[PDB]
Design a protein around this ligand. Structure first.
Ligand SMILES: [K+]
Ligand SMILES: [K+]
Ligand SMILES: [K+]
Ligand SMILES: [K+]
Ligand SMILES: [Mg+2]
Ligand SMILES: [Mg+2]
Ligand SMILES: [Mg+2]
Ligand SMILES: [Mg+2]
Ligand SMILES: [Mg+2]
Ligand SMILES: [Mg+2]
Ligand SMILES: [Mg+2]
Ligand SMILES: [Mg+2]
Ligand SMILES: [Mg+2]
Ligand SMILES: [Mg+2]
Ligand SMILES: [Mg+2]
Ligand SMILES: [Mg+2]
Ligand SMILES: [Zn+2]
Lengths: 123, 56, 204, 35, 150
RNA sequence: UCUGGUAAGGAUAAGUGCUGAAAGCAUCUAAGCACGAAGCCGGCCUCAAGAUAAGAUUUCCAUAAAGGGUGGUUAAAG
RNA sequence: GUGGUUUGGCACCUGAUGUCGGCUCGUCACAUCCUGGGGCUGGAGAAGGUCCCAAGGGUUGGGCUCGCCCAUUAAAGUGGCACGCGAGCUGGGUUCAGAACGUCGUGAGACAGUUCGGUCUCUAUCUGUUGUGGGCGCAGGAAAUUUGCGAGGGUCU
RNA sequence: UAAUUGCUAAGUUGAAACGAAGUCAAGAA
């Protein structure tokens, strides 16, 4: 049973899963849109949006707490600069997931996840 | 552990009754005019729900 | 007789004489009479009741016409009850004050679902052997299922693995602690089957 | 009450419900069944 | 090629002579009446009887509750059945069948004097048993029959 | 942690009786009538109309969202 | 006389019908251990003895290996199911190759004997059983609420 | 579901020593 258990293990050990989520968060912050499997993107949406909410308080404390998740200097700089400037005044829902198709090698369901403020044609 | 008898052609086909290939869920593009998977970005034009999503 | 209800949760109260009691809170709520069944037309006497208000977006046209005949707003859950001590017309309301004089009630619900379960959890099987002392791979195994070539079969009713829970269960003789008609609330002593939000049948 | 294959007789022999009885209300230690 | 030129003709679905008859069970014995009813249903009284065709009569039995069982059979005949589970043998009586309904007793007796195949399973549906003398079978014009003549 | 098993509704077993011939006496029995068991059939709980004997009652009836399927967000359901 | 549960008699089935006890899971019978209803007593009551009706449910944990003992319990029943059950378990016992003692034999070796050690294979086809779906039928197409032909469970003290 | 004459009331029907004798029939003292 898994009644009211609310995160995906993603077929990995806990340390591997946390490392992969941190890497995906850094990749999404650096390149504003990335392509990945649907399940991984849905886990990343849970993981990464509380991290973007921490940039609404530009302090040393919030920078350090964000760095505890990220451990990436360039990602931290971009996130507390341009990403924060763009996602100010948006009350959550910073990301969007759109499905695209299937892979040749394993028929994995594919999608891309992006930040809604860096897509112009989607208003 | 071991089949006592070999199966007849009829028995084999009766089991294989329920083997089938799933039909994809295809929607028509009202503007573009082609097939794409429902709830999925139309890869020919890159549009999704009337808005451009993937810029060629 | 009885009404429909929705289980909210559990709490603990202190009685008048200083006894700690575990209580279940049930929102019994107003139930409307949607159909009346007769010996002369249906073959038995019963009252059909509807419980939770539904919008037109979620009501099929046959159900909408069925409610329109009784002149009531559409409901979400219907159930029949029997042996009412009185006469009740089509489209009238019953509330939790119906249970004000009652001392004990019976609660019918659907238990929580466990999915596929083995013999140890489903039936309390002892398990084969010990965890050590030569155990190979039968720790949670059923053991023997028959008695050799004289029956030469497994009997019907043999206890095996399978789906557990998610089925109708009745609990009888739950003491009523308090009735709150201002909130449509009923407090009973003990536990009722099901998860929070599940629909119950409360029989007087 | 004594049950035996051969029952024999102031005791009186009666037949009740397809069974044979030898009864004596004066002395109840002589009742017999299943003649 | 056919060198016979003198054959016996079998009746078929388009050549049978099916009729509705009404018989009474006022004081008859259960088995003795049901044997004649089985003959009527099978079609042994028709000169064009064909064992592979439903060529009999549709029989309506009236006054079914007035049937007679001699001796102590009403409670001394023990019918046995099995539910399929261990320790699952059960007993019942013609009195139990009569309490449930006369049609059940009559159907149980007639199925047992009928052939044990698909045709007999089809034939048993041509029998209609009613407790009283009132039944509703218009548009077919059933013919009264004296079962004591047979 | 709460709840339950419980009585005996009906027919009875072994036994206890009433009236009573055969056999003018007697007799619980052959025509009859009272009882009398954790045992039998029920009451209680769950499943149950493929019960092909396929039952009943209310309401609606073809294309949009009369009914559905495919799809999506998901669940104390799996 | 009955039974076939003891010791036997017979030799009819068997290019393998492959193993004692214990564990697990049962199911059945009654020749009743407890609980229920009774007749008799050399039955005053109190418990006892014997017989009849009755198989629904129950019928412990240890020190030892059929039986004895310790402490309980209302009670710690008797049997059948390939001495139920190893394509479900174990491997203490038992058919194996090493070794030792006693006894027997000139010897190789043997034994109503004893003792230490000593591989338990198989991905479930059919049937069986526990769960869960698809199709069609009933029925011209449906959404709901239901009756109960029957089935199973419950029944201790 | 023939005809005629009897017997069985146990659904007997389609295993013994040993007990009542349930019932019909034939007798003798
Ligand atoms: K969280
Ligand atoms: K068998
Ligand atoms: K054995
Ligand atoms: K039952
Ligand atoms: Mg895994
Ligand atoms: Mg680590
Ligand atoms: Mg397949
Ligand atoms: Mg569940
Ligand atoms: Mg264990
Ligand atoms: Mg091992
Ligand atoms: Mg292991
Ligand atoms: Mg010979
Ligand atoms: Mg062979
Ligand atoms: Mg085996
Ligand atoms: Mg050696
Ligand atoms: Mg060693
Ligand atoms: Zn398009």
């Amino acid at each position: 049973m898994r009644h009211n258990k609310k995160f995906n293990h993603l077929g990995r050990k806990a340390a591997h899963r946390k490392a992969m989520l941190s890497n995906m968060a850094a990749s999404l912050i650096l390149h504003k849109r990335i392509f990945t499997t649907v399940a991984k993107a849905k886990a990343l949406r849970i993981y990464v949006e509380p991290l973007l909410t921490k940039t609404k308080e530009d302090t040393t404390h919030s920078r350090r707490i964000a760095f505890s998740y990220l451990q990436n200097k360039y990602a931290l700089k971009e996130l507390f600069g341009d990403v924060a400037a763009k996602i100010a005044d948006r009350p959550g829902g910073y990301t969007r997931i759109l499905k695209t198709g299937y892979r040749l090698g394993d028929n994995a369901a594919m999608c891309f996840i992006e930040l809604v403020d860096y897509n112009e044609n989607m208003l | 552990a071991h089949p006592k008898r070999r199966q007849s052609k009829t028995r084999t086909a009766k089991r294989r009754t329920h083997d089938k290939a799933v039909m994809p869920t295809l929607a028509k593009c009202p503007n573009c005019g082609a097939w794409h998977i429902y709830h999925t970005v139309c890869g020919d034009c890159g549009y999704y729900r009337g808005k451009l999503a993937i810029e060629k | 007789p009885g009404l429909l209800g929705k289980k909210i949760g559990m709490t603990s109260v202190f009685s008048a004489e200083g006894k700690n009691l575990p209580c279940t809170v049930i929102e019994v709520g107003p139930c409307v009479v949607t159909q009346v069944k007769t010996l002369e037309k249906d073959g038995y006497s019963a009252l059909q009741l509807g419980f939770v208000d539904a919008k037109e977006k979620h009501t099929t046209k046959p159900l909408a016409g069925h409610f329109k005949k009784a002149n009531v707003a559409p409901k979400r859950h219907l159930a029949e009850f029997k042996n009412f001590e009185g006469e009740h017309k089509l489209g009238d309301v019953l509330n939790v004050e119906f249970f004000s004089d009652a001392d004990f009630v019976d609660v019918v619900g659907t238990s929580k679902g466990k999915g596929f379960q083995g013999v140890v959890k489903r039936h309390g099987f002892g398990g084969v052997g010990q965890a050590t002392h030569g155990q190979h791979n039968r720790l949670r195994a059923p053991g023997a299922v028959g008695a050799c070539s004289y029956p030469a079969k497994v009997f019907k009713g043999t206890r095996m693995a399978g789906q557990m829970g998610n089925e109708r269960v009745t609990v009888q003789n739950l003491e009523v602690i308090k009735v709150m008609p201002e909130h449509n609330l009923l407090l009973v002593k003990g536990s009722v089957p099901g998860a929070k939000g599940s629909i119950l049948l409360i029989e007087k | 009450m004594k049950v035996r294959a051969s029952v024999k007789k102031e005791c009186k022999i009666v037949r009740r419900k397809g069974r044979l009885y030898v009864i004596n209300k004066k002395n109840p230690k002589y009742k017999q069944r299943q003649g | 090629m056919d060198t016979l030129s003198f054959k016996t003709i079998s009746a078929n679905k388009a050549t049978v002579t099916k009729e509705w008859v009404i018989v009474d069970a006022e004081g008859q014995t259960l088995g003795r009446m049901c044997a004649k009813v089985a003959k009527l249903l099978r079609g042994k009284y028709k000169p064009n009887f064909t064992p592979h065709v439903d060529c009999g009569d549709n029989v309506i039995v009236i006054n079914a509750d007035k049937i007679v069982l001699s001796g102590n059979k009403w409670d001394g005949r023990i019918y046995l059945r099995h539910t399929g589970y261990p320790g699952g043998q059960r007993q019942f009586t013609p009195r139990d069948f009569m309490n449930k309904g006369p049609e059940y007793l009559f159907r149980k007796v007639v199925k047992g004097m009928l052939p044990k195949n698909r045709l007999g399973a089809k034939i048993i549906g041509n029998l209609y048993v009613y407790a009283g003398t009132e039944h509703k079978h218009e548009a077919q014009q059933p013919r009264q029959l004296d079962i004591n003549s047979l």
